[PDB]
Amino acid sequence: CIMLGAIFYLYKAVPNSLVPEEDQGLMISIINLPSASALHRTISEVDHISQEVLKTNGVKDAMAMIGFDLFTSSLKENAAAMFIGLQDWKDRNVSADQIIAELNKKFAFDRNASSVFIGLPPIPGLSITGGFEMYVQNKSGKSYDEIQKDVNKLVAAANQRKELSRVRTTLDTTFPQYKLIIDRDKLKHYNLNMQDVFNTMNATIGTYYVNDFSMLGKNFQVNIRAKGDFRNTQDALKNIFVRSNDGKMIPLDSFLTLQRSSGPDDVKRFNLFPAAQVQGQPAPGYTSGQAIEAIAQVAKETLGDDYSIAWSGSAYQEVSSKGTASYAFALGMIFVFLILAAQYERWLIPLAVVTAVPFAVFGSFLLVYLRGFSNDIYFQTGLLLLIGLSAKNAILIVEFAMEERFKKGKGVFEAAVAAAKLRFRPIIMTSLAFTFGVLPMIFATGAGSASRHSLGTGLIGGMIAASTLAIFFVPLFFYLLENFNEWLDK
């Protein structure tokens, strides 16, 4: 019973995690020049960053997609994403943990263009392995320059304290634009139609697709557009004419007076309503589940009477439902107890087999505590295999104890010892053929070591304590329960 309490503290004092990240030769960089900017200036910086990343001894190949921002899934000209490939672990002498801690420290605190280096997650299901991805809607329909002023109440306070340390939002209405202001009085005083003035503006300072032409079999577009030198100016609208109804040519500088403004570059609609994406990840020690329960609580406080705190990404797959993780293990134990109760022919005997399981979880949760690991899911995977093996050996032990006490006729004490004596040889030789078998996973050198370094460290200590610590107590519980069963004859 003292060991049982040792498992309660062993389980409460280990980090509750999910999956562990591992070194698969892969790197991603989110290059972001200042807003608006230009394409050629992004190219001048992409070929400058793609040159110093090849300088590291652990980098093999690189490639970038200029003019497409991954922060928004749009192709904004002021950003670019770079895909880097690392050398093989047989050649590289360093991992990607210190390479990222080196590069995202060398670049992200210096250049005018922000470049954060990260890595692709191991399993494509999760969005950021620990954080969230929620959208905030608005059924009332308000201007984006005000919803921008409302999401700031959430993000700026979600990073203050509480349970998160990096809550981000991807909505930005402070993007530079040229808002054209129309003068409908002028446009019609000048005897013009609006379908004409904007059809001729799409052919000068815009792209206009007229028809297709034949060449090499495929039919490609043809596009009319003014030469680039008469469009890059602030007010290039001063030299574009439109044929009036009367017959005169009229400059667009009369009624279309252009002026600067601010507005969002990428407008996102999540479930019929305008929404903003919120992304982040918890603090070092906080679990993922309660961190999703954190933004939900604080968003009920700093929002309005029309903003739906909607959910998406992985944070929605966890919020969807609950109440299943227990009523599966429970019926599993009931089916286990009945399967054995039908075999041993007694009701109070299968409890002896069940008692040999806390030994496997004690030795498995102990070695992952000393080595300093966290109970992920690759470690709990081997925990299932150990319970299935620990309980297996315990079945045959109580089986021979029942056979020794009731067939051979030996006493309860002499049978509880003679049974453990019979089962001792196979239990050891399976353990030596298994602990040594999955021993190469402890010193695993290669890809996917996050699993095997936690799988091995889990079921090696579990196998030791389920076949050396456990084989002493299975006979004790048979001795206790069988004597109590014969007592009940009175």
Partner: protein, 246 residues
């Protein structure tokens, strides 16, 4: 199988969109899987009388009806009457002829002065003169409120003034159609008819409907209430309880 039969009808509509009148092609023939009966019928109304009736229809077409179309199992959720507000232009043939304006002049003027067109960007790529930044161009070509629609000028007079649309017509945000109304115990109420899929669980989906209506009830304004007096599945629930009794 509802789907095997659905995508077997599809392979006959597109197969026979050749022997088809051209006018029906442009709006598109629509094929869908939905039951021919009605699963339930929701009713919303003002418990006091401030929300009226035509306004409640709008609260449905803005916050309620869009969410009802997405709960699992429902096939359709149309609000009858089509009484969501439109921007109505009420011409007066007297003032149309007092100013020599035929109705077609108002048609092209509204169609042209209210539309929205593509503009472009300033200084993108096929350029030799260096451009530091790159700017988008916001447009704003539609008209939001009815006052801007009244100023749609049909004719430009030689004396500088313009013949505006208000001078020959009335503009107001009214309704797409008032060909029908609705009652619930005599009160002005908006009816919402909920359909079922082709083979869903009527008990399951109709229960998720009432659960979603309760969710949207927390954001109802003032005395806007709702009642669902017609539900073909409540009889099933009340008849299941009778068998447990039996």
């Amino acid at each position: 199988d509802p789907d095997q039969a659905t995508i077997d009808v599809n392979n006959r509509i597109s197969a026979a969109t050749a022997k088809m009148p051209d006018a029906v092609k442009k709006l598109g023939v629509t094929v869908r899987k939905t039951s021919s009966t009605t699963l339930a019928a929701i009713s919303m109304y003002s418990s006091d009388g401030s929300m009226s009736a035509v306004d409640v229809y709008n609260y449905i077409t803005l916050n309620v009806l869009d969410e009802l179309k997405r709960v699992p199992g429902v096939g359709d959720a149309n609000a009858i009457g089509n009484r969501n507000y439109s921007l109505r232009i009420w011409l007066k043939p007297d003032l149309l002829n007092k100013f020599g304006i035929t109705a077609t002049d108002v048609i092209s003027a509204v169609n042209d002065q209210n539309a929205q067109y593509a503009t472009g960007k300033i200084g993108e790529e096929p350029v030799t003169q260096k451009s530091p930044y790159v700017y988008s161009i916001t447009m704003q070509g539609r008209l939001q409120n009815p006052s801007e629609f009244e100023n749609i000028i049909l004719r430009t007079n030689n004396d500088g003034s313009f013949l505006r649309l208000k001078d020959v017509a009335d503009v107001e945000i009214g309704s797409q159609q008032y060909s029908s109304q609705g009652r619930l115990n005599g009160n002005d109420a908006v009816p919402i008819m909920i359909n079922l899929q082709s083979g869903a669980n009527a008990l399951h989906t109709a229960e998720l409907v009432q659960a979603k209506m309760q969710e949207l009830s927390k954001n109802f304004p003032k005395g806007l209430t709702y009642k669902i007096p017609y539900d073909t599945t409540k009889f099933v629930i009340e008849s299941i309880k009778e068998v447990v009794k039996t």
